[PDB]
Design a protein around this ligand. Structure first.
Ligand SMILES: [Mg+2]
Length: 118
RNA sequence: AAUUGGUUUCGCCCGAAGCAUCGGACCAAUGAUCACCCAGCACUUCUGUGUAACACUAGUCACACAAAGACUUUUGGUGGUCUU
């Protein structure tokens, strides 16, 4: 059901976060979010988004969340894919993925809703 | 005449488990010291993407860009050495 480009990225940084015990460089996380097409990869992106939040504090002792521009780009990834239920989770104040709510995410949701006419 | 069993002690042969002492051996971990790889805090962008004025639709600032950069410094890994 998912795509191979996001699957082979996903298992790669899961192998890095669980076996090598070093955090993966953010370039491949970004190339994971740039390659999402169908409905059935954003849950694997959420699994990665959860594992990285775990590892950043667990090993590297990093307390803050993912940053605001990353919130906008994961919002635009999910809303261009079309999963509205997964996209609206990006504005949640209490989430396991560390997605700080912002305004640009709601702007992207309202832009898609403008195009979709709901 | 011959004959059967003990019990104690001493000299030789072999050496179960064990404690002791050496020896290679970086065996398996731990500590130290080198390097190498990500990432973070400071930063600079002619880089893309959003907020807010204005200007008629372009500019100007605020941001995070991780998108790079290059000295530092830290967290975690990796690979060598300690008269091991
Ligand atoms: Mg013996």
């Amino acid at each position: 059901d998912p795509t191979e480009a996001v699957k082979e990225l996903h298992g790669k940084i899961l192998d890095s976060v669980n076996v090598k015990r070093s955090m993966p460089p953010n370039a491949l996380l970004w190339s994971l979010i740039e390659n999402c097409r169908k409905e059935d990869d954003i849950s694997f992106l959420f699994d990665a988004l959860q594992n990285l939040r775990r590892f950043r504090l667990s090993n590297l002792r990093i307390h803050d969340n993912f940053n605001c521009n990353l919130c906008q780009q994961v919002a635009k990834t999910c809303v261009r894919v079309g999963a509205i239920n997964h996209g609206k989770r990006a504005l949640w104040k209490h989430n396991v993925h560390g997605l700080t709510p912002s305004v640009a995410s709601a702007h992207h949701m309202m832009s898609y809703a403008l195009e979709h006419k709901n």
